[PDB]
Amino acid sequence: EAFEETHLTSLDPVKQFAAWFEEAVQCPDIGEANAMCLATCTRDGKPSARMLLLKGFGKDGFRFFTNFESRKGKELDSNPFASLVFYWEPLNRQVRVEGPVKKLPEEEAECYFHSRPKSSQIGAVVSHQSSVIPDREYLRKKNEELEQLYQDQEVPKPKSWGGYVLYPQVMEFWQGQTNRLHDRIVFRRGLGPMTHRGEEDWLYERLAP
Amino acid sequence: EAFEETHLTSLDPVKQFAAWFEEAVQCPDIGEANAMCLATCTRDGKPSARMLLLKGFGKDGFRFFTNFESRKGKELDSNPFASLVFYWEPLNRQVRVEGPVKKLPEEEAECYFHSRPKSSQIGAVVSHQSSVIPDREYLRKKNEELEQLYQDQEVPKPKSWGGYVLYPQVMEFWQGQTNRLHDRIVFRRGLGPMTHRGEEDWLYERLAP
Ligand SMILES: Cc1cc2nc3c(=O)[nH]c(=O)nc-3n(C[C@H](O)[C@H](O)[C@H](O)COP(=O)(O)O)c2cc1C
Ligand SMILES: Cc1cc2nc3c(=O)[nH]c(=O)nc-3n(C[C@H](O)[C@H](O)[C@H](O)COP(=O)(O)O)c2cc1C
Ligand SMILES: Cc1ncc(COP(=O)(O)O)c(C=O)c1O
Ligand SMILES: Cc1ncc(COP(=O)(O)O)c(C=O)c1O
Ligand code: NA
Ligand code: NA
């Protein structure tokens, strides 16, 4: 089926994302519909990328949780701009999001951290994410010891652990097609004869595949 | 099962990639084992990312084909550094590759271009990839007209279409595990007590998850 401007669910790309995300979640052949690739880079243009989970989305943007002292956390703190890719192979769909990133409030991060299974909370205390470690037994040992320490106790959120929110400035909706002639509808914040008004300060236009 | 330094297939990370890639290809639950996310960025640190197919790999690096006048092609030409992510959900594995990018020789690009189905060759001539276009009918029309033009003829490769090779400087092998305590073995080109010699100029070390 065609992916067409006149059959979008919404000209607010966050609501269009919600529509596609719901379809992904309802597809039995998709495991984690909220898996996404996060691209970051140094201020002088050395890029990096890794898989993350989306952990909430709405008008203020796309939220995710990590260690601020990891390789991505140092890049985001020095250069607060990122890009996201969602790829849903069984739907032949891709969503791209570009925007600036801010840290979430500490009390929000505390709340999310304590909502996680206790084993994941202890894992976050164990791991100085992306630091060099000697072997896997080092993690297994420290993890077992922290299980003793936190028996019947609350696990404190590490000072270095928290969340980010990416405020969308660009959102591309890609629908795959034959002959490599895909449908691309791209929203950007802001008129040319091929540029169209969406909701709020959004504009949208079609890009060649 | 543990992902362990003493049970790597190879201390040449390109051969370790080959081993994991073969397992991905042999997994019926993986559609395109060669799908990867490419992260690029401007010289002043504005990142971008999108799905691509890997189209060959070996000692000289990881090859892929695109339009040099696309958004990624302008970034790569201005700032010849990229990052790749392979994510194989059914194997709980991720591979990350960082390195500089060069353009492939024109005669190599010609050969690869003419190996593609004719409909994909014509699609590449139709599409000024990532340029703004008016509607999807614009592509359908131009594509049908180029089918007439190239009936029984060779489709010339566009001057703007070709390939890149990413020479690996960093390669991370990520194997997912319980409690978010994953196995990360990271090769980099080059000794600390946690740094180990691989093949050639490679070093490897374990990173905290
Ligand atoms: C599907 C998937 C989901 C992941 N989700 C997260 C996550 O939400 N946060 C996180 O810190 N790492 C997550 N990881 C691990 C990252 O890919 C990465 O190993 C880690 O964040 C360190 O990246 P860095 O060294 O670039 O900072 C996930 C990995 C996979 C494969
Ligand atoms: C699984 C998958 C594979 C793709 N493979 C390629 C490819 O090899 N080359 C390419 O130019 N675009 C490919 N695309 C399209 C890109 O995601 C993207 O739309 C296009 O390259 C333009 O990106 P840019 O605007 O950042 O330059 C693929 C898309 C998907 C979903
Ligand atoms: C637009 C575009 N160009 C090029 C490629 C490279 O793949 P192939 O040469 O098999 O068409 C792809 C892959 O899906 C693509 O979508
Ligand atoms: C290391 C790591 N931290 C954090 C997360 C975020 O997910 P959750 O809060 O559900 O553990 C993940 C997701 O897989 C992860 O691998
Ligand atoms: Na649905
Ligand atoms: Na195999």
Residue numbers in the entry:
A (entry chain A), B (entry chain A): 46 to 235, 243 to 261
Paper text:
The enzyme pyridox(am)ine 5′‐phosphate oxidase (PNPO), whose catalytic action yields PLP, is one of the key players in this pathway. In both human and E. coli PNPO, PLP works as a regulator of its own production because it binds at an allosteric site of the enzyme, affecting the binding of substrate at the active site and inhibiting the catalytic activity (Barile et al., 2019, 2021).
In order to further confirm the location of the PNPO allosteric site, we made several attempts to obtain the crystal structure of the protein‐PLP complex. On the basis of this previous experience, we carried out co‐crystallization attempts with either the wild type or the R225H variant of the human protein and PLP. We obtained crystals with both protein forms; however, PLP was detected only in the active site of the wild type protein, thus a clear indication about the location of the allosteric site was missing. A substantial part of the N‐terminal end is not visible in these structures: the electron density map starts from Glu46 in the R225H and from Ala47 in the wild type structure. Moreover, with respect to our structures, the conformation of the N‐terminal end in the previously published structure is different. This observation indicates a marked flexibility of the N‐terminus, and could explain the fact that this region is missing in the electron density map of all the crystal structures solved so far. In the human PNPO, the coupling between the allosteric site and the active site is weaker, and PLP can bind simultaneously at the allosteric site and at the active site, forming a complex in which each subunit binds two PLP molecules.
